[PDB]
A paper describes a structure:
That is, Ara1 catalyzes the reduction of α,β-dicarbonyl compounds such as methylglyoxal, diacetyl and pentanedione, which are known to be toxic metabolic by-products. Microarray data showed that environmental stresses, including heat shock and oxidative stress, markedly stimulate up-regulation of ara1 transcription in yeast cells. Here, we determined the first crystal structures of Ara1: in the apo form at 2.10 Å resolution and complexed with the coenzyme NADPH at 2.00 Å resolution.
The asymmetric unit contains a dimer of Ara1 with an interface area of 1030 Å2. The two antiparallel β-strands (βA and βB) at the N-terminus cover the bottom of the barrel. In the apo form, the cofactor-binding pocket and the active site are relatively open and relaxed. Superposition of apo-form Ara1 on the the Ara1–NADPH complex yields an r.m.s.d. of 0.25 Å over 297 Cα atoms. Analysis of the Ara1 structure shows that the three loop regions (A, B and C) exhibit relatively high B factors, and this structural flexibility and plasticity was supposed to be necessary for the recognition of more than one substrate.
Numbering used by the authors:
A (entry chain B), B (entry chain A): 15 to 344
Write the structure that this text describes.
């Protein structure tokens, strides 16, 4: 009965646009793609006004289907919602195409936020059995990732810029990036005019990303936290400090890991397909400065990056070797 | 450094419309009417997206002038703002006129919320020197308030409904009431079709209004707290428990008195003309269930209603005799 609910908190982007601090993640497994629809419906019914998706997820049509029904029955209006999608590295140089395909899949006229998914460029390998006739993450027979020979990752954002700045184009309300390092953002700020509204990265008490947080705050860029539970197994719920503070604030570990970000001014997009936990996990734990420092200390002592797939290896921040299991044995 | 700011919290009215939990009050003293303009401008630039005013205040023109300048220089868009105004008992049976007069004074095409200011009806006494050619709060030669003899207070709300329900009238987005008791709300619910989105009343640690809170929650009516500091001399700032919790949560007394309401899901509209205080007092104290009960218990043991003018005496809830100063001895 106490407020705010995390669904009731809105942050301001650097272009003056408000974004709900809590959003639903939709990077669901291939066997569960169609379950996205009921999750989005459940989320919005419980008060979510933010849905995060992507061209690469193959969940856009199910996001679109859920929205269509809530529009039709008068549960929601388009302008009430904040919809994010992303351009995958395979279309690094075909942003316009990526956006139109995303909008068609979503059955929408515009998205609120469009991101560069990775600072990466992939080769375009034909495959009828892929996404839009292309291999999502191409490898050779070795099998190592096939990066585009002529690829410049900033070309994606430059094309994002051009759509955002075109006074005759109303397909986006904001642009941003995902998985960018300080170093890459510096190049972007140096070479580009539009300041990304967000940098969507993995962050949570096992990966506080302190230096990135400080940098982004200094440059008017909001972080969006993905995999806040630690992806598969939700290992972050097992952190003793997380359990302790959840008990103290009379909330679930889920609420605590959400609140960890919102408290620090960070947008958070937990992924779930469970309608019950989606509807229930909306409580706020307003953690003290000392509690945040305790949580952040833990992360620096036991760093774990759960999302670190082979394709990300060329990035100085990513190893490509997945998580370090040695730091989970605390 | 920490979030949410109180400017970042949005509640949902029963018609789906979102209202910012924090609003600027504009019932400013007659000597200081013009100072409202800089206060509104300061508020909006600081992050406020909710301005509360009334036909009766004579501050509408200054609210409108502040808004116009912010619209014109691109600081804000109309749809970003939530604007509330109110119908005074002198126009209890002329809601259309009141609304049009407010809209003219504000320089706006619509208000987000239109309230019945009091469950009262005043006689119309001509005075070219008064507001809209009328005495605001008429007293007879004997000095007593001149109520409309044929007056039914609920007629005001019924006129509000008509404007609200009219598919071809876009002057309002929501309606509600102010200074209503449980009993008056019960008659409203029995006789009318539209559930008031809010009931705006004086409430704070000295006047917790526990029973009204429970009723309104059950019937999906949001409370809006006015005079949260306790009017003249801001006496609530001096409550030992308020200073105590303020220090605990690293916030000012002002912030704590705002947070008291927002934590309980109550909209709050502190009135201020101090631009530096308006800008800085946006911090949130996420009070526990125990600390709120401490504050609410204080109000039950030390009840003080600060807003209680002679004109409200005929209402069972009001005495007309102002604050009980004997409950200020602490």
């Amino acid at each position: 009965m106490l407020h705010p609910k995390t669904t009731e908190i809105y942050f301001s982007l650097n272009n003056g646009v408000r974004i709900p601090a809590l959003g639903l993640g939709t990077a669901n497994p291939h066997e569960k793609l169609a379950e996205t629809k009921q999750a989005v419906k459940a989320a919005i019914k419980a008060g979510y006004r933010h849905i995060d998706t992507a061209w690469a997820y193959e969940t856009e049509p199910f996001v679109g289907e859920a929205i269509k029904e809530l529009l039709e029955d008068g549960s929601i209006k388009r302008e009430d919602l904040f919809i994010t999608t992303k351009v995958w590295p395979v279309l690094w140089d075909e942003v316009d195409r990526s956006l139109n395909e995303s909008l068609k899949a979503l059955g929408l006229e515009y998205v609120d936020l469009l991101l560069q998914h990775w600072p990466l460029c992939f080769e375009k390998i034909k495959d009828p059995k892929g996404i839009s006739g292309l291999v999502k993450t191409p490898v050779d027979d070795s099998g190592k990732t096939m990066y585009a020979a002529d690829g410049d990752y900033l070309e994606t954002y430059k094309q994002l810029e051009k759509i955002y700045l075109d006074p005759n184009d109303h397909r986006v309300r904001a642009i941003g990036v995902s998985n960018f390092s300080i170093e890459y953002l510096e190049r972007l700020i140096k070479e580009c005019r539009v300041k990304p509204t967000v940098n969507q990265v993995e962050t949570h008490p096992h990966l506080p990303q302190m230096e990135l947080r400080k940098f982004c705050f200094m440059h008017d860029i909001l972080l969006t936290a993905y995999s806040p539970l630690g992806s598969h197994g939700a290992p972050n719920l097992k952190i003793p400090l997380v359990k302790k503070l959840a008990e103290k604030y009379n909330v679930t570990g889920n609420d605590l890991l959400i609140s960890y970000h919102i408290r620090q001014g960070t947008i958070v997009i937990p992924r779930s397909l469970n309608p019950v936990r989606i509807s229930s996990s909306i409580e706020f734990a307003s953690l003290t400065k000392d509690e945040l420092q305790e949580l952040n200390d833990f992360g620096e002592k036991y760093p774990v990056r759960f999302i670190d797939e082979p394709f990300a290896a060329i990035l100085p921040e990513f190893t490509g070797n997945g998580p370090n299991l040695d730091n989970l044995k605390y």
